[PDB]
Design a protein around this ligand. Structure first.
Ligand code: HEM
Ligand code: HEM
Ligand SMILES: N=C(Nc1cccc(COC[C@@H]2C[C@H](OCc3cccc(NC(=N)c4cccs4)c3)CN2)c1)c1cccs1
Ligand SMILES: N=C(Nc1cccc(COC[C@@H]2C[C@H](OCc3cccc(NC(=N)c4cccs4)c3)CN2)c1)c1cccs1
Ligand SMILES: C[C@H](O)[C@H](O)[C@H]1CNc2nc(N)[nH]c(=O)c2N1
Ligand SMILES: C[C@H](O)[C@H](O)[C@H]1CNc2nc(N)[nH]c(=O)c2N1
Ligand SMILES: [Cl-]
Ligand SMILES: [Cl-]
Lengths: 362, 362
């Protein structure tokens, strides 16, 4: 079954991919080569063109992603050649620097060797390459609560955080053949961060909030024609609400709304005052203003939705079915002000795609 | 099949209902009576206790309703005795007055005779008993665009609106046996309306916005143990966002956000300014403030969600499965600030329940 699952996926992927690249005539021979290779080796190797286009199709099929208009401009870095942890580390450093691009963020994915027989060659522990640590002890909470378990795992391995609210977690990954992951401190010169200020409320800086410029998801498996790239970190730029309405606002994250209410000079006493809503809007305004002021790429939820509308129109024009997850596409600030809220989406899963996988710790 | 569908529903309803009312011992005899009656007459008649509890269970099972905590306090008016249009009209007038209760709104349902063989005894045309007319002609738009088709149907029948933006539609319904519905102008003394002002922005009154106090849904079918009450208008009080974030804000409704932006003194030029979001919050603040100031019942979305949490806890304690429609339960303003956004709901349909039915015009 396992080898048969592989061939079926390979057949479906190669037809669709070559069809899109105008290479339909080459499908027959390529499929022949692939079948022999699966018979001989138990797997097959993608061409660079297949791998690149596979990564792009996977983004295009990501139901939960509002940013999909730009799927075809994904920058694909092929690192299937990596064999050592120094090579992994340096490829990750390189991804951070080239994706960041001095603030003009380039959507990028770095693809490491795929799983062999469900056996990982490189097992990444970080949820994102750049992420803040989190600590909870004796009632005391510091940093990002969502990082508590990885943070504890890093410290078990000899790392120590400074216990500010914004400690950068080190990169941490394990190589096939090692019992323990290794970790490396992020060079601060690689990491752009944005202090959060407000366009007209001077006191807002008293909160001393910041966030990192580039979100680089490093814990998802990219699947392309039956090949499982468990290690394939990718980035885009942020939609403002991810930071203002969730990372900084959620009670189980940085939980800043009451503090926001205070500095913008409103009472946080009555539900009917909609103080949480007002705080959310001002904090979200501050986040967009701060990123733009620093020349770091970001998109507001209105502009992102307008772009997504164009993505929908583009799918229809190309004769491709559109899939989407309504519950994730709607922004968490004023969702009914976007077209998304007022229509429905087929949440069917199409491959290539990005998938969750179990974490290697806990 | 039709008669068999009826008996199966009746059996399931009577068991559950009597079980809830501690009347389990009486199920056997009641079921016997019902079966004879279905055999003799092709239907059966609910007792007042069944009818009342059925209407309450139906509210409790309404997946899309955030207000369900108070299901058991529904005030049920039994008007199965109605035979004339004067009786219908007067029952509807009475419902408006007793539900409104000088502003201390009482959740109420008035239940008219049920369908016989899919044949309606009373066919209500209004979507709500109190609702504003809408007009579109020669590019000119007046009133509520969502009322355009019923408004045109009323005017075909000799009604004429004044063409303000807030014309009250007349009650309009048809009796079994008549080819044409009748219509009656709402007595203005029955209708509470709330002018929309803002707690600290004096200029907000320049917009001259208002809304009616009591939403009375008059176009849904109540189904209880296989009996179809197509005409059974019900009301609660408003959640503020229904008015501030949708009725007054949607582009295809009153579309007031740009005008709101102007009176609150902000530019409506840049998506990144989140002017729509800020306008939404201030308009929603104004709506809550205005209702409270006038002593008309209303709930904000934070308080409603907290109540809904208690409803969830209550279902669990009672050993009842909870059903819900996540996409409707989340409020359209700051949904991620409520617990609802962060969990999921089983959207299974349980009866008794309220259902859509085709409109009798167009
Ligand atoms: C170019 C700018 C992009 C923007 C503004 C954007 C925006 C978003 C947002 C707001 C989410 C929801 C995340 C959350 O609520 O936590 C999301 C989800 C997602 N995006 Fe994008 N995205 C972009 C680029 C990309 C790229 C380059 C990829 C991969 C090649 C990608 C794949 C995904 C996936 C897989 C998810 C779902 C993650 C999950 O299920 O947990 N996106 N995107
Ligand atoms: C007591 C105060 C109540 C509040 C605050 C409340 C709140 C709400 C809200 C906000 C909605 C969504 C409506 C929309 O977006 O257009 C809703 C839907 C609904 N409510 Fe309630 N509700 C209340 C009482 C009731 C009562 C008394 C009933 C019937 C006995 C009821 C049955 C429903 C139904 C059937 C829907 C769904 C309508 C549809 O599918 O279109 N609710 N409720
Ligand atoms: N357990 C792990 N990670 C982990 C640890 C703690 C918490 C979480 C929560 O993650 C699950 C969901 C997944 C989701 O993650 C954040 C996310 C996902 C996708 C896009 C974006 N935002 C962007 N603008 C972009 C980023 C990249 C391109 S665009 C953010 C929220 N939350 C995961 C694993 C490590 C290794 C394997 S699994
Ligand atoms: N076509 C008809 N009506 C009609 C006409 C124009 C537009 C619409 C749109 O209606 C569909 C959905 C249905 C939904 O209606 C508004 C609504 C439904 C339920 C609760 C509330 N809000 C409340 N707080 C409460 C009211 C009562 C108790 S709590 C509001 C929105 N929109 C219907 C019909 C007339 C007769 C039979 S069908
Ligand atoms: C339970 C619910 O499905 C869950 O909280 C989802 C809702 N929609 C979301 N949408 C986005 N974009 N991001 C999220 O983390 C979530 N959380
Ligand atoms: C298409 C989408 O399902 C639709 O616009 C829904 C979304 N959720 C909603 N939720 C509520 N409460 N009311 C609505 O009218 C809608 N509209
Ligand atoms: Cl994030
Ligand atoms: Cl309404």
């Amino acid at each position: 079954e396992e080898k048969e699952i592989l061939w079926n996926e390979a057949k479906a992927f190669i037809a669709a991919c070559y069809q899109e690249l105008g290479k339909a005539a080459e499908v027959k021979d390529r499929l022949a080569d692939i079948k022999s290779e699966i018979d001989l080796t138990g797997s097959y190797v993608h061409t660079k063109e297949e791998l690149e286009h596979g990564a792009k199709m996977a983004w295009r099929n990501s139901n939960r992603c509002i940013g999909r208009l730009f799927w075809n401009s994904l920058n694909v870095i092929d690192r299937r050649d990596v064999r050592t942890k120094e090579e992994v580390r340096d490829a990750l450093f390189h991804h951070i620097e080239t994706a960041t691009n001095n603030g003009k963020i380039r959507p990028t994915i770095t693809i490491f060797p795929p799983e062999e027989k469900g056996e990982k060659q490189v097992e990444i522990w970080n949820h994102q390459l750049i992420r803040y640590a989190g600590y909870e002890s004796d009632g005391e909470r510091i940093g990002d609560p969502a990082s508590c378990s990885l943070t504890a795992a890093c410290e078990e391995l000899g790392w120590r955080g400074e216990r500010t609210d914004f400690d950068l977690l080190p990169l941490i990954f394990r190589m096939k053949g090692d019992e323990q992951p290794v970790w490396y401190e992020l060079p601060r010169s690689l990491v752009i961060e944005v202090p959060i200020t407000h366009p007209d409320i001077e006191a807002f800086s008293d909160l001393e909030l910041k966030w990192y410029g580039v979100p680089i998801i490093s814990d998802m498996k990219l699947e392309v024609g039956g090949i499982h790239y468990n290690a394939a970190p990718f980035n885009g730029w942020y939609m403002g609400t991810e930071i203002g309405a969730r990372n900084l606002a959620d009670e189980k994250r940085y939980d800043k709304l009451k503090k926001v209410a205070s500095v913008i000079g409103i009472a946080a006493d009555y539900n009917t005052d909609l103080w949480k809503d007002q705080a959310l809007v001002e904090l979200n305004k501050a986040v967009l203003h701060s990123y733009k002021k620093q020349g770091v790429s970001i998109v507001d939820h209105h502009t992102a939705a307008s772009q997504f509308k164009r993505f929908e129109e583009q799918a229809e024009e190309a004769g491709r079915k559109l899939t989407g997850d309504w519950t994730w596409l709607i922004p968490p600030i004023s969702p009914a002000a976007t077209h998304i809220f007022h229509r429905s989406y087929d949440n069917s899963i199409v491959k290539p795609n990005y998938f969750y996988q179990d974490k290697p710790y806990e």
